[PDB]
């Protein structure tokens, strides 16, 4: 390094190239993976991360943990990216993707160290991934009966398997039934915004409920609100986007008068405008009035005098859910409040829910939405419950799209590893080593399951390999029995697309990391 009088790049530019930088990248990926290792399986644990502000978060979800980590290593960020991608496309398996990617990299690390050309490794990974995806598609069990009870049982089992790793795993049957019931009421797009999730502090987990309708918190009632009745046995709901207040007609409106009679007439005209809006609403026949915009004290007292219910500043999402549950239309003008644009529910009620007041719209027969009310002892308790239910909801949605399942608990990975090893035994031998390494890396999932559960991973892996080679497709880790079992009859079911996407994303990330030969960092500005 002779110091050139004028250096090429900016001073402070760091460049690392060759084998050592790739080995360092593999080590960084290992470091990222080991931060989420213990959160895998029914014996997995939770991680607590405290940000700079001191607001802690507790999660069993791999994507959440990785996002909360301030990863700055350029090669390590790929694992976080693929975790986010798996969360977006599937919603479950955000730990499996990272574990598989890091295990691929660790398996091929010795070959990289001895000067093997990375293009060969990339080609071997792509070949193995294509074969594994085809095998998953081929051996996935699908039921071509179109039986409603069978489909419901499949969805419930998939939701239970997705949920049996969180703090709500004790009530996993209850929560899976609730999730399946919630999802099956969505019409055709299965939009997440049509499933409300409300977190109300205090109460046991079993106190959580799913309302066949819509529910939301009471929103800053004005004076005279307590004089309104709080229960109706067949209300008509007037969904509105209207500000029912005494205000200027327009912000740029100016009134110019030169007579006291005109002054009184103007005051009476403002009052008459407000009362005309209120009278149209009242004569529409509705009993419950909800507005996206504020409703003033005058309107609140007006509705109280008519034995009506009013609520202003209702959030837009809650109004859309009320539309979907009751079947009306949000009206920005009250001039045409025909019976068709009015919502209808059997029972409306305001009740006490754990130190808060909520409005309940129940008895909707044509409902296309639902609202989860989650009870817990702490904010992070309810947050983790919401994350777990989101995982279950995504799994149920994907299973609705296509009902193809593969037994979990490491069964699918073991079968794929056996298939890939059998294939690799029948190729020249440069690709054979790498495909065998891929197959060996596939064994990370049952090994990590056994490690988290506290078993002896080696003996369980040997038994699993012997069972798969001898015959049997769905044999995996049995956590409770300290042994192995046919995970298909144990109803450890996951959709095939979860593993398909996991393998695809892990392979793509491993190939991307391997293909990089030099890292250059410019000085910060």
């Amino acid at each position: 390094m002779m110091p050139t009088p004028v250096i090429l790049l900016k001073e402070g530019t760091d460049s690392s190239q060759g084998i050592p930088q790739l080995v360092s990248n593999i080590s960084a990926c290992q470091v990222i993976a080991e931060a989420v290792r213990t959160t895998l399986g029914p014996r997995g644990m939770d991680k607590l991360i405290v940000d700079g502000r001191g607001k802690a978060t507790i999660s069993n979800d791999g994507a959440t943990i990785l996002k909360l980590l301030d990863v700055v290593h350029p090669a390590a960020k790929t694992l976080v990216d693929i975790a986010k991608s798996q969360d977006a496309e599937v919603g479950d398996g955000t730990t499996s993707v990272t574990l598989l990617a890091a295990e691929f990299l660790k398996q091929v690390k010795p070959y990289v160290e001895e000067g093997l050309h990375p293009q060969i490794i990339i080609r071997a990974f792509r070949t193995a991934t294509q074969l594994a995806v085809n095998k998953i598609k081929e051996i996935a069990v699908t039921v071509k009966k179109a039986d409603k009870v069978e489909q419901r049982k499949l969805l419930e089992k998939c939701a239970m398997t997705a949920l049996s790793s969180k703090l709500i795993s004790q009530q996993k049957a209850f929560f899976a039934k609730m999730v399946v019931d919630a999802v099956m009421m969505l019409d055709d797009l299965l939009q997440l915004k049509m499933i409300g999730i409300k977190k109300v502090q205090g109460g046991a987990l079993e106190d959580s409920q799913l309302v066949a309708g819509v529910a939301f918190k009471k929103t800053f009632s004005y004076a005279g609100f307590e004089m309104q009745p709080k229960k109706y046995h067949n209300p008509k709901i007037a969904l509105l986007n209207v500000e029912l207040e005494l205000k200027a007609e327009k912000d740029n409106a100016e009134i110019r008068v030169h007579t006291v009679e005109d002054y009184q007439a103007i005051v009476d005209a403002e009052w008459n405008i407000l009362y005309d809006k209120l009278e149209k609403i009242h004569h529409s026949g509705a009993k419950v009035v909800l507005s996206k915009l504020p409703i003033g004290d005058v309107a609140t007292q007006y509705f109280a005098d008519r034995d009506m219910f009013c609520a202003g500043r209702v959030p837009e999402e809650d109004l859309k859910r009320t539309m979907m549950a009751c079947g009306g239309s949000i009206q920005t003008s009250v001039n045409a409040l025909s019976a068709d644009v009015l919502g209808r529910c059997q029972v409306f009620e305001e009740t006490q829910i754990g130190g808060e007041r909520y409005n309940f719209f129940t008895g909707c027969p044509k409902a296309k939405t639902c609202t989860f009310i989650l009870r817990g002892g702490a904010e992070q308790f309810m947050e983790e419950t919401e994350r777990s239910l989101h995982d279950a909801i995504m799994i149920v949605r994907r299973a609705i799209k296509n009902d193809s399942v593969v037994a979990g608990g490491g069964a699918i990975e073991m079968e794929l590893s056996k298939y890939l090893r059998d294939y690799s035994r029948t190729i020249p031998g440069k690709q054979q080593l790498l495909i065998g390494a891929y197959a060996k890396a596939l064994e990370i999932i049952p090994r990590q399951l056994c490690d988290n559960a506290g078993f002896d991973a080696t003996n369980i892996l040997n038994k699993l390999r012997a069972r798969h080679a001898q015959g049997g497709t769905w044999y995996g880790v049995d956590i409770n029995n300290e042994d192995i079992a046919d995970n298909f009859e144990a109803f450890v079911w996951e959709p095939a697309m979860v593993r398909i996407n996991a393998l695809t994303a892990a392979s793509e990330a491993a190939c991307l990391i391997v293909s990089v030969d030099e890292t250059i960092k410019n000085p910060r500005s």
Binding site: P20, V23, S24, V31, M45, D46, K47, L48, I49, V50, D51, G52, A56, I58, N60, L69, D70, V71, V72, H73, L167, Q170, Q201, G203, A204, L205, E206, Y222, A223, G224, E226, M227, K231, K247, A248, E249, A253, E254, I255, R256, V257, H258, V260, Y263, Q264, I266, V267, E270, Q301, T351, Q352, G354, G355, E356, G376, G377, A378, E379, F381, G454
Partner: protein
């Protein structure tokens, strides 16, 4: 044992993974569990001294030096300045118990601390924490079923309030207001029963106004079946007392009307000025005449008024109150049976509320005046007026009465009770131990630990009352086993008997169930956490 790992690569090149990783810290494995258990044990041991009738208070000081003396566990934990995350979890647990039930905020913390204490030795014996959590969950299920089995139903009707009085008394026994014990219990019961939807529906708390003024005596606290208002009559010369007042609630300021829209009234000649002045004078006279025409005796406004209106009200024998807050307007309208009127043009006789007596009340050598609206016909709103020797006991009385109201509300929601004094915990522990004898071996340890942790409440009660904990608890448990009587507890007050059914120690069943459930869930969370990643930067 921090900053994750440190390698700097096998080749010596820099190895930076996480932003500011050299300054962050982390705890992994069983050490994190032990630290969390230690923190929770510290919090629970601090809190357990404030448990029972002989429990002592904690004097809490905030940032600005203001001091509150209290026995409420939720308040103590809310005002506590903690930094450990597990301590914050304990605080949230206590707040959750307060929100759902309103009583038992001290019990949940002690129970969770005991559960984690037992889990500590269970972990040291080589058991996976998830196994401990599952055993705790199934033991809690058994305990809740037993609690449901040994409960008793009480009458929640107006004619016979004695069980309700006893329940409120049991709630208030540990608070400093026990010097007026039955009086506070009775006023809380009457307040809840007055403002309550009959068909087992909710009790709406904003219909209960809790107001405290210093001076007087704590025994002077009384229940007002009406509204107490911090305001007084607008003019100094209107009478201080109105009999059979016909209230006229208004939300229109007694001022000339003003449009909301930007407006300009043009005066272009002397005739315009004369017309404007006549309009103002006639508007004042017209509004006063409109108020008087309904036959009203009193006028209540929300936005105040000006001098001409004030003197016209005084001249027409119409006492008035101005600047009354919106919640107070709503409470007055609800209690008196009148309707809130937005303008004088809509004021009619049918919208006038009725109050038997409206009076202005002085408070000694203080010049402060407060207005009483009571003797309503069928007042659906109630007010509690608290007096005391200093503001600290006033705040403590406020929260104690809130606890009593919450307990009576819970009783309204569900009328099943269990006998406290440690009897419920002893019976639940006995049931858990009996069930554990039939369970497979591995979960037996977790269930036995749960039973031992349940046994801590009678231990704390006996220790706080000066008795020997182990001997007393063992004797009571043996008596409960030998004769089937789940009502035997810890004689904290030394009344000479252990039967809490005779001593009238009553607890809401749902309160106990919520205690056990919340403690189990928080313990499960704390056991499930095995990794901490704090910034560790210790900024200013």
């Amino acid at each position: 044992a921090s900053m994750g790992t440190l390698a700097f690569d096998e080749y010596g090149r820099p190895f930076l993974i996480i932003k500011d990783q050299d300054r962050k810290s982390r705890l992994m494995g069983l050490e994190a569990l032990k630290s969390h258990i230690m923190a929770a044990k510290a919090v629970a041991n601090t809190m357990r001294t404030s448990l029972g009738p002989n429990g002592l208070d904690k004097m809490m000081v905030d940032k600005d030096g203001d001091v509150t003396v209290t026995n409420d566990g939720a308040t103590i934990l809310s005002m506590m300045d903690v930094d450990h995350q597990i301590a914050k979890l304990m605080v949230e647990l206590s707040k959750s118990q307060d929100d759902e039930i309103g009583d038992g905020t001290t019990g949940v913390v002690v129970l969770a601390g005991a559960l984690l204490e037992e889990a500590e030795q269970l972990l040291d014996r080589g058991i996976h924490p998830i196994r401990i959590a599952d055993g705790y969950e199934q033991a809690a299920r058994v305990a809740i079923e037993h609690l449901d089995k040994i409960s008793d139903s009480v009458l929640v009707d107006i004619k016979d309030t004695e069980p309700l009085i006893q329940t409120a008394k049991t709630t208030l026994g540990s608070k400093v207001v026990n010097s007026c014990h039955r009086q506070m219990a009775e006023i809380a019961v009457n307040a809840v029963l007055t403002v309550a939807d009959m068909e087992r529906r909710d009790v709406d708390f904003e219909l209960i106004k809790v107001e405290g003024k210093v001076g007087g005596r704590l025994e002077d606290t009384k229940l007002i079946k009406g509204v107490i208002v911090d305001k007084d009559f607008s003019h100094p010369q209107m009478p201080k007392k109105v009999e059979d007042a016909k209230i006229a609630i208004l939300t229109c300021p007694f001022e000339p009307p003003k449009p909301k829209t930007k407006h300009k009234l043009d005066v272009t000649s002397v005739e315009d000025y004369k017309a404007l002045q006549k309009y103002e004078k006639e508007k004042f006279e017209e509004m006063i005449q409109q108020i008087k025409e309904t036959g009203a005796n009193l006028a209540i406004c929300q936005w105040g008024f000006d001098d001409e209106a004030n003197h016209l009200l005084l001249q027409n024998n119409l006492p008035a109150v101005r600047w009354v807050g919106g919640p107070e307007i709503e409470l007055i309208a609800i209690a008196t049976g009148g309707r809130i009127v937005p303008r004088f043009s809509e004021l009619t006789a049918e919208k006038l509320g009725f109050a038997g007596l409206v009076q202005e009340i002085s408070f000694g050598t203080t010049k402060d005046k407060m207005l009483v609206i009571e003797q309503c016909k069928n007042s659906r709103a109630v007010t509690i007026f608290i007096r005391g020797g200093n503001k600290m006991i006033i705040e403590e009385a406020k929260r104690s009465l809130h606890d009593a109201l919450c307990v009576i509300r819970n009783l309204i929601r569900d009328n099943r009770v269990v006998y406290g004094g440690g009897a419920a915990e002893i019976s639940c522990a006995l049931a858990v131990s009996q069930e554990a004898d039939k369970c497979p071996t591995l979960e037996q340890y977790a269930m036995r630990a749960f039973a031992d942790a349940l046994e801590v409440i009678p231990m704390a009660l006996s220790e706080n009352s000066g008795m020997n904990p182990i001997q007393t608890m063992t004797e009571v448990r043996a008596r409960q086993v030998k004769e089937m009587n789940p009502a035997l507890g810890i004689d904290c007050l030394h009344k000479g008997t252990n039967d809490m059914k005779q001593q009238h120690v009553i607890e809401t069943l749902i309160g106990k169930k919520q205690q056990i459930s919340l403690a189990t869930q928080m313990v499960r969370m704390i056991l499930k956490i095995d990794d901490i990643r704090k910034p560790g930067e210790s900024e200013e």
